[PDB]
Design a protein around this ligand. Structure first.
Ligand SMILES: O=C(O)c1nc(Cc2c(-c3ccccc3)[nH]c3ccccc23)nc(O)c1O
Ligand SMILES: Cc1ccnc2c1NC(=O)c1cccnc1N2C1CC1
Ligand SMILES: [Cl-]
Ligand SMILES: [Cl-]
Ligand SMILES: [Mn+2]
Ligand SMILES: [Mn+2]
Lengths: 554, 402
């Protein structure tokens, strides 16, 4: 059928005419296939024959499936010239946000696009031509009366048509839940098996009234349904079956695929780990290069294969209950979480493993994970979960009220799931009496890649080192690193590098730079460290001295 | 009849994605938009309109209120509302003892919108978890939050306010977006009587918060007043003053720096020399006044930076080029995001009163966190442009309070 729904008005782009691409000459068998296909389409009203006056054309082709031919229309020129449409690809539901149902039925619409009418005033622009044999005579000309396959507007127009058609039915059956995806409909209810079937029948009849055919009960697929990499029953969901290969040799291609599969499973299998596997891809080039698994990657894989050994499903959402989100630290930079309404029946799980910058601490990371989960929760359930975090109220509060960036997180409470996040050191707020004062500095040359780092002290001491393969910034961190190694358990340090100050001041506990990591070790060793800053070349006390020192020969 | 509107040269409509919203806000918008549609204010639209502008709900009272984020449409309409139909900003407003802000947005819904422009005002009410397609509308009348609305409506507004202005020649009334700012020098009681009077005038046409600008004072950079001074103290002082000198002509540190001779212990006490003490007094004297030499340029954007100071305190500066500060200030009062939201609204209100423009904000917070929470506390009917930054620890320090 062709739906009697009103058409969507369509236009070409402001300063543009319809396409006029010349039809390529085709072999005889393909001309035959097309004549036969179009003859049928014509009889069903999908296309109409047109005259010579219509100046537009778009190339058509035919391709043997099997022993069946398919009609292909190359709509690039038309698509280039067609207006933009309201985006259809705006997001899909996550299964964990769905509500449990007694029954869910899938109905696919037959010849979906061809069952929806195209704007009358726009049909002319879709003209195509079946070429005569060796192009001796004029070709047979048709234009479309329905949404063509491969045309820009089809997806969006089909979906908006389906929505209008469903509208009265939804108004009449408010407790029936329908989800539209491409040419499928998922129809769920809490009715008993008999009345559910009846309701499906009414939907089909309503759909048919509007030109849309669907499979009858005999031909309807049985659960679980495969969709978007998930597998769905009325009462639980999981990801599609994943089989991890057993192989001696792993190419970059294999490892990339394995990591994607593991990342995908991690939305319902708790504890999935991919860090060690990912390190294998570092600076990785040829997809065919074999990468020897490291012992750690080999164990990680095994630990994963074990987690995947037996099926795990997520449960659906109950809107009358709170969401609970728990987070655990796994390794460094690695976080894991689970979301449930009754312990411990997970709606979904997840992992967070992102470094925002080169330098952070665990308190900042945990807060970032909370934010990520919070955004996700709004999307999926339209509300915020209550968190259980492996951090003490005081630890978190000391940190954020002191730090210069703002934050807020939803309601939460401490849960004793080691490892706990703590502050590994705290810089003093005031300078330290009876602690040696170290003035530090550093230099390097822009075309030398060489430089120096050193310190001068109020107790008369000094030192300068030579650095190879270093920047003006790296020397600044080296100097502070020097001051720390050579000082007692309490030290005051004066830098003129806002750069170095910025870093240390944020109280990092991990870093991409090994220099910084080394400094972090020192800071954790000290009993007290005060760090202060002064402007370079203001002729300040000990700063001038050390500047002098390290700048020699540079 | 409608006024024809055009986008700027070769610019296309906005195509901004709708943000995810909580359940309660979606319900609110649904009911608000159903009623608006019944009343002809908006109509449902099809997929042949590819434009979109985000929409939010705010709690205004316990009555939800639709807020459309027209920031992008505004940017793409600037030739129209600014150069073609600009609304002049009175320099007198900021000098008034009292300024009351009135919401006159309801006015716009009685003026039809140019039919060919309606498509650009498309918006979408989303569903939770993308379970159903969003509900799509566009406007048939002037929309609240679009800078085109007051520009188009202004000749009607002039006619509306004409009797009131004639009868109270010393009262200054200024329109910015959905609001009316009304300033006078009357005792607080008499001012309020005049505002109620104005509302009666407004009410005849379907149009239905107190500031005190002449009590806005520069927020000086503060110099410590010390009993005795350590090398650390003097080192901090010189750093701070050195930065100040990049802003204020005349700032001197020569004398103060003399004290910092030799490689000395941070906690060592060191007596001030009588001339350093003088140098200090003079710098302190300069830091009280506005920066000599900084003037507002009407062809340039305003920028506003904010620093979190701790304990519910916040500092901010407004400039068009860093450290050419046009204005510096503070906000006071814990929920960091709620406070920042409040400070942003306050800073924006002052900029409208002072210059007739909103600043682009530099916000000391992670993007996602702000995006998640700002609408929980937002009450204003405009939204400034913003971006997110990491405050340099020294900037915070140098603008510290006492
Ligand atoms: O450590 C730094 O960041 C560092 N930076 C510089 C860069 C620098 C400053 C400067 C003046 C006051 C405050 C900060 C920088 N003034 C300069 C004048 C000319 C060239 C370079 C500089 N020069 C140094 O000698 C130095 O040690
Ligand atoms: C793929 C999909 C997307 C969105 N919703 C659903 C489905 N499919 C289901 O099988 C499903 C399962 C359980 C509950 N709702 C479901 N439905 C809803 C319609 C009844
Ligand atoms: Cl390194
Ligand atoms: Cl005030
Ligand atoms: Mn330096
Ligand atoms: Mn130096």
């Amino acid at each position: 059928p062709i739906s009697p729904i009103e058409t969507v008005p369509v236009k070409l782009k402001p300063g543009m005419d319809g396409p006029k691409v010349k039809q390529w000459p085709l072999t005889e068998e393909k001309i035959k296939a097309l004549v036969e296909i179009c003859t049928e389409m014509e009889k069903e009203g999908k296309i109409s024959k047109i005259g010579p006056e219509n100046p537009y054309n778009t190339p058509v082709f035919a391709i043997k499936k099997s022993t069946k031919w398919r009609k292909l229309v190359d709509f690039r020129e038309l698509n280039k010239r067609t207006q933009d449409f309201w985006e259809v690809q705006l997001g899909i539901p996550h299964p964990a946000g769905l509500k449990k149902k007694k029954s869910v039925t899938v109905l696919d619409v037959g010849d979906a696009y061809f069952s929806v009418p195209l704007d009358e005033d726009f049909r002319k622009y879709t003209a195509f031509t079946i070429p005569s044999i060796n192009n001796e005579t004029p070709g047979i000309r048709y234009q479309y009366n329905v949404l063509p396959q491969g045309w820009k507007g089809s997806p969006a127009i089909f979906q908006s048509s389906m929505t209008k058609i469903l509208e009265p039915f939804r108004k009449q059956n408010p407790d029936i839940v329908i989800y539209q995806y491409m040419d499928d409909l998922y129809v769920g209810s809490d009715l008993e098996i008999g009345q559910h079937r009846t309701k499906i029948e009414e939907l089909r009849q309503h759909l048919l009234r509007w030109g849309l055919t669907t499979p009858d009960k005999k031909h309807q697929k049985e659960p679980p349904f495969l969709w978007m990499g998930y597998e769905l029953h009325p009462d639980k969901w999981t990801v599609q079956p994943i089989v991890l290969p057993e192989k001696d040799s792993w190419t970059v291609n294999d490892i990339q695929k394995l990591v994607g599969k593991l990342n995908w499973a991690s939305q319902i299998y708790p504890g999935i780990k991919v860090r060690q596997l990912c390190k294998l891809l570092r600076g990785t080039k040829a997809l065919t290069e074999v990468i020897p698994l490291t012992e750690e990657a080999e164990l990680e894989l095994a630990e994963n294969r074990e987690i995947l050994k037996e099926p795990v499903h997520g449960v659906y959402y109950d809107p009358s209950k709170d969401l609970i989100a728990e987070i655990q630290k796994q390794g460094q930079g690695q976080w894991t979480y689970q979301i449930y309404q009754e312990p411990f029946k997970n709606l979904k799980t997840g992992k967070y493993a992102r470094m925002r910058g080169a330098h952070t601490n665990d308190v900042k990371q945990l807060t970032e994970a909370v934010q990520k989960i919070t955004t996700e929760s709004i999307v999926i359930w339209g509300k915020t979960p209550k968190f259980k975090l492996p951090i003490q109220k005081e630890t978190w509060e000391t940190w954020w009220t002191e730090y210069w960036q703002a934050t807020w997180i939803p309601e939460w409470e401490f849960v004793n799931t080691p490892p706990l996040v703590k502050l590994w050191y705290q810089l003093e707020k005031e300078p330290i009496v009876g602690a040696e004062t170290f003035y530090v500095d550093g230099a390097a040359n822009r075309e030398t890649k060489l430089g120096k780092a050193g310190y001068v002290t109020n107790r008369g001491r000094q030192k300068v080192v030579t650095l190879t393969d270093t920047t003006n910034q790296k020397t600044e961190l080296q100097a502070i690193y020097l001051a720390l190694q050579d000082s007692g358990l309490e030290v005051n340090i004066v830098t003129d590098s806002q750069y170095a100050l910025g870093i240390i001041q944020a109280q990092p506990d991990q870093s991409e730079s090994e220099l910084v990591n080394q400094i972090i070790e020192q800071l954790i060793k000290k009993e007290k460290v005060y760090l202060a800053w002064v402007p370079a070349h203001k002729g300040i006390g000990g700063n001038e001295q050390v500047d002098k020192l390290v700048s020699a020969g540079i | 009849e409608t006024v024809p509107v055009k986008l700027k040269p070769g610019m296309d409509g906005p195509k901004v994605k709708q943000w995810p919203l909580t359940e309660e806000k979606i319900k609110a918008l649904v009911e608000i938009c159903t009623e608006m549609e019944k009343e002809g204010k908006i109509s449902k639209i099809g997929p042949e309109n590819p434009y979109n502008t985000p929409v939010f709900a705010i709690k205004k009272s316990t009555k939800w209120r639709k807020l459309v984020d027209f920031r992008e449409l505004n940017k793409r309409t600037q030739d129209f509302w600014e150069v073609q139909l600009g609304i002049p900003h009175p320099a007198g407003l900021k000098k008034k003892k009292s300024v009351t802000v009135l919401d006159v947005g309801d006015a716009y819904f009685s003026v039809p919108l140019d039919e060919d422009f309606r498509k650009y005002t498309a918006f979408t009410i989303p569903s939770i978890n993308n379970e159903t397609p969003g509900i799509r509308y566009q406007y048939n009348v002037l929309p609240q939050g679009w800078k085109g609305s007051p520009a188009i409506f202004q000749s009607s507004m002039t006619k509306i306010l004409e009797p009131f202005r004639k009868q109270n020649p010393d009262i200054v009334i200024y329109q910015y977006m959905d609001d009316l700012y009304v300033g006078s020098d009357l005792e607080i009681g008499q001012h309020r009587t005049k505002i109620e009077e104005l509302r009666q005038h407004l009410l005849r046409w379907g149009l239905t918060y107190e500031l005190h600008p002449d009590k806005w004072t520069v927020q000086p950079i503060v110099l410590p007043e010390k009993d005795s001074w350590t090398v650390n103290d003097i080192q901090k002082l010189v750093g701070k003053l050195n930065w100040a000198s990049q802003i204020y002509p005349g700032i001197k540190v020569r004398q103060l720096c003399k004290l910092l001779r030799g490689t000395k212990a941070l906690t060592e006490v060191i007596p001030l020399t009588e001339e350093a003490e003088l140098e200090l007094a003079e710098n302190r004297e300069i830091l009280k006044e506005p920066v000599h030499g900084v003037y507002y340029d009407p062809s340039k954007d305003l920028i506003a930076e904010i620093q979190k100071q701790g304990q519910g305190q916040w500092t901010y500066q407004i400039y068009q080029e860093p450290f050419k500060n046009l204005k510096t200030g503070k906000y006071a009062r814990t929920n960091d995001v709620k406070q920042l939201t409040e400070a942003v609204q306050k800073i924006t209100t002052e900029s409208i009163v002072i210059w007739g423009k909103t600043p682009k904000f530099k916000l000391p917070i992670q993007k996602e966190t702000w995006e998640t929470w700002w609408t929980e506390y937002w009450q204003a009917t405009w939204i400034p442009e913003w971006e997110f930054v990491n405050t340099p620890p020294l900037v915070k320090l140098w603008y510290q309070l006492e």
